[PDB]
């Protein structure tokens, strides 16, 4: 009965993960919405037939959705630990009453981590005819990474239901 | 169409049938409730013995 | 011990498929709202990326 | 057209059919029902000792 | 109550071959279709005034509704067994307590 | 009576073989379960039209699945000893009197 | 026995006849969900085979 109960503190481990993973998806779901619209705009700014106030007006906007996913990466903390951020390598929780840990690996979202590396915009038309193929990669990237928090999540919801 | 007629097999075979559980369900509960009176009844037996002494 | 007291395991596999049910109903819901089979990315990653990328 | 064509391939690769939905949403409902039903019906188990004594 | 026992145990043969026949019924509903297809093809082809080009077309529609054919009829199998593809001669169940039987003979398509 | 008395002694051992073989039986069902997963899992990796991006998904689905598998299998110990992990060929419990016994063989999963 | 704790034939009966109405009812609603009397080699082997071939 000793080791029942030792399940019963493991279940707690087992939740406060589910939680962290769950916040980090929401914030992973804006940014790849952000990713989407920064793709547009690197694309529309590429056109050589444009006047100087419609470059201004597109770098804006694209700078101001960069500024979005920094602030959308940085907030994605639960209990003070995240696995989006870059902060931490790896998280562990309890998984078997004799110590053993379910070990779910820090899919850094954040500029940084997706090779946007802040402060990056377009001087001329032919940036961002190269800024088209970073977007494209950051976006593949994160999408990646997306799938295996997905695939950890899942995995923290079934051995939560086997240990119960 | 094959999936669902896959799936309409298994259920055939594995499924249950609730009208019969209910009847049943009610006819057990009153034999359990009749029970636990009969082993009431049968314990307070030989308590007559004390008056003998 | 079929009298017992202190514990009784119907009401463990009553709660354990109750709980099961509740699941399924909650992905039918999210189903329902979102209008979409893959909504997230735990429905299954490879089809949802190749949507979002699409 | 073609992005008429891209929009109409990724929606038919993630797009749900409700008139199956609505089927399975009935189904779960009602099985719940029965669920805690029986979840009750477990409870008042043993509440029956306490008249042998 | 030997027997009457024994006869829960024959309804369970009966609804297995009950599932049986019926992914039988499915996959020749759709290969009678398939058939009719084919003919209609096959009608098609016959005709003496259509050029190199037509022909092959017809003759790659049937090529395909005759694989599909073949497809449709070799996956109706439940529990392992088959009395579509050709693979045994008659299926048969209980039928009665003293272990008679009900047989359904194999109608291959 | 000293016979009774041990038949009393009997019935303890049978009652923890019961405990033993049913934590056994949660564990299989959970391991059947996680089996089917990663059958479908396979059957969608084996198509040969899919992006590098999605076989490594789903390369890694099926690698968490079998750890599943693995942490679910040997945890099914009760008392210590296990039916389903594969450190014992057969299990012997109390069955008569006398000394006799029950002997329950190892399903390893 | 009249007073039998054991069994009892109403039950039985009512559950047969309740069957027999529900295979009524399934009945019905093929025919309302295909619109058409023989839809299968079931209903009638004959009139289906006739018609396929027609």
């Known amino acids: 009965s000793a080791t029942a109960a030792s399940m019963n503190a493991v279940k707690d481990s087992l939740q406060r993960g589910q939680s962290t993973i769950d916040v980090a998806l929401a914030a992973g779901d804006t940014i790849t919405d952000l990713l989407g619209k920064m793709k547009e705009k690197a694309l529309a700014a590429s056109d050589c037939s444009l006047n100087t106030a419609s470059f201004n007006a597109l770098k804006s906007d694209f700078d101001s959705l960069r500024d979005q996913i920094e602030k959308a990466a940085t907030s994605a903390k639960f209990n003070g630990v995240s696995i989006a951020d870059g902060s931490t390598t790896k998280l562990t929780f309890l998984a078997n009453s004799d110590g053993s840990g379910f070990t779910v690996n820090a899919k850094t979202i954040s500029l940084a981590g997706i090779g946007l590396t802040t402060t990056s915009t377009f001087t001329t038309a032919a940036a961002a005819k190269t800024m088209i193929g970073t977007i494209d990669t950051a976006l593949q990237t994160a999408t990646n990474k997306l799938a295996s928090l997905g695939t950890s999540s899942v995995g923290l919801d079934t051995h939560l239901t086997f240990v119960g | ?27 057990l509960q009153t034999k359990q409730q009749l029970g636990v009176q009969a082993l009431s009844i049968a314990n307070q037996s030989s308590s007559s013995i004390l008056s003998l002494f | 011990a ?21 699941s399924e109903l909650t992905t039918v819901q999210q189903r329902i709202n979102t209008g979409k089979k893959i909504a997230s990315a735990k429905d299954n990653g490879a089809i949802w990326a190749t949507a979002k990328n699409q």
């Open chain 3, 2 to 22: 079929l009298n017992s007291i202190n514990t009784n395991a119907g009401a463990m596999i009553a709660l354990q498929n109750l709980n099961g049910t509740n």
């Open chain 2, 1 to 27: 169409k094959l999936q669902d007629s896959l799936d309409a097999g298994v259920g055939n075979l594995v499924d249950a049938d609730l009208a019969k559980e209910s009847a049943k369900l009610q006819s």
